[PDB]
Design a protein around this ligand. Structure first.
Ligand SMILES: Nc1ncnc2c1ncn2[C@@H]1O[C@H](COP(=O)(O)OP(=O)(O)CP(=O)(O)O)[C@@H](O)[C@H]1O
Ligand SMILES: CN(C)c1ncnc2c1ncn2[C@@H]1O[C@H](CO)[C@@H](O)[C@H]1O
Ligand SMILES: [Cl-]
Ligand code: NA
Ligand code: NA
Length: 351
């Protein structure tokens, strides 16, 4: 199709969205508002969900972000994606949902395993997420992935992909490293990724051109890599000065104190507060960016799940268009704000 502008790896997941009664959460020992991995006792939550007529939509963090890129670029195969699915009905449902949008995909099938699934449980105007990765964990990047991805200079992985193997993201980043106009981009994804994969992520960051994350992820990064003094590790990132220090320290995990012509950028989303970024410019000096976030009244916010996925997709779309860092952040804010004002993790038809 193409031209392919962005290539990503991810955990492909079918989201099953339904309104459920409170007894549903209680019966499954879910805490309202949390996002967890299915426990043994939640084995039957997905079949049990069928009685609440859930809707099926494509999910997975990275898949949501490249579906934003593909929607904005329009041409079939503008974004490419790989991950693993099962040899089950759910895998086919997910594949067809992605094909209809024109995304370029190669889904590796793992015989006998179930396609990733996330129950998105709506109750008391909150979402409770319960994910079972299944076949996602089997993903191993194929040897010809660079041929599949031909033409793309922007690569993306979530730290959530480290739960299959860090070797996938490390291979993608390893291909981009040292090529001045190849851009490997990474999401911190969740506090647990920062701790569980500390040493693999330290290595990965050295090969990273753009790091995305939210405040709690960066707070965890700063504590695990001692990026700030102990006295500061507890400081609110709602404080600009603290946010800037954390971003600036995180940037050193990308740069290692070296300066090349390659992109080196850390972007911290901060909810309603301005986005803060630290950039190593051409000559090595570090510039801090602060981009205000247009006000969205609380009553208009349906749910903030998927806001960061959408932010990243808008940012990478703008980056493919050669836009400045501030413009890329503004496009990410626009996409995130569309998505948080309706049900669902996709851009609206009208966007
Ligand atoms: N209350 C709000 N007002 C306007 N924009 C919002 C917002 N909350 C999120 N955003 C938009 O979405 C982006 C990502 O926000 P955030 O840093 O909260 O991600 P997040 O994953 O932490 C949401 P949550 O913590 O609720 O799961 C922000 O950069 C902004 O563009
Ligand atoms: C490894 N884990 C926990 C996960 N890996 C990748 N995507 C995930 C996820 N757990 C939840 N999701 C997805 O997050 C989106 C909302 O930001 C949902 O689409 C859901 O499938
Ligand atoms: Cl993912
Ligand atoms: Na530089
Ligand atoms: Na939404």
């Amino acid at each position: 199709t193409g031209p392919m502008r962005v290539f990503a790896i991810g955990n492909p997941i079918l989201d099953l969205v339904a309104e459920v009664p409170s007894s549903f959460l209680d019966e499954f020992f879910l805490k309202r508002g949390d996002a967890t991995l299915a426990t043994p006792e939640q084995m039957r939550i997905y079949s049990t969900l069928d009685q609440f007529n859930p809707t099926s939509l494509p999910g997975g963090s990275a898949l949501n972000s490249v579906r934003v890129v593909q929607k904005l670029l329009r041409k079939p195969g503008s974004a490419g994606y790989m991950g693993a699915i099962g040899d089950d009905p759910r895998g086919q449902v997910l594949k067809e949902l992605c094909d209809k949008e024109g995304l370029a995909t190669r889904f590796m099938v793992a015989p006998g395993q179930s396609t990733g699934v996330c129950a998105v449980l709506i109750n008391e105007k909150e979402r409770t997420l319960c994910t079972h990765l299944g076949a996602c964990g089997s993903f191993r990047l194929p040897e010809d992935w660079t041929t599949f991805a031909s033409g793309a200079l922007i690569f993306y992985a979530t730290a959530y992909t480290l739960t299959a193997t860090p070797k996938n993201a490390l291979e993608v980043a390893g291909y981009a490293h040292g090529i001045p106009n190849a851009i490997f981009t990474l999401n911190l994804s969740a506090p647990f990724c920062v701790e569980l994969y500390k040493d693999a992520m330290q290595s990965l960051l050295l090969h990273t051109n753009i790091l995305f994350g939210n405040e709690e992820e960066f707070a965890h990064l700063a504590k695990v890599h001692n990026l700030v003094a102990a006295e500061k590790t507890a400081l609110s990132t709602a404080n600009k000065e603290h946010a800037v220090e954390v971003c600036t320290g995180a940037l050193r995990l990308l740069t290692a104190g070296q300066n090349t012509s390659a992109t080196k950028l850390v972007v911290m989303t901060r909810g309603h507060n301005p986005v803060i970024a630290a950039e190593q410019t051409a000559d090595g000096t570090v510039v801090v960016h602060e981009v205000g976030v247009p006000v969205v009244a609380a009553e208009k916010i349906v749910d903030t799940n998927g806001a960061g996925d959408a932010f990243v997709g808008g940012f990478l779309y703008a980056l493919s268009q050669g836009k400045t860092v501030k413009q890329c952040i503004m496009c990410g804010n626009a996409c995130a704000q569309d998505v948080i004002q309706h049900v669902g993790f996709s851009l609206s038809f009208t966007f």
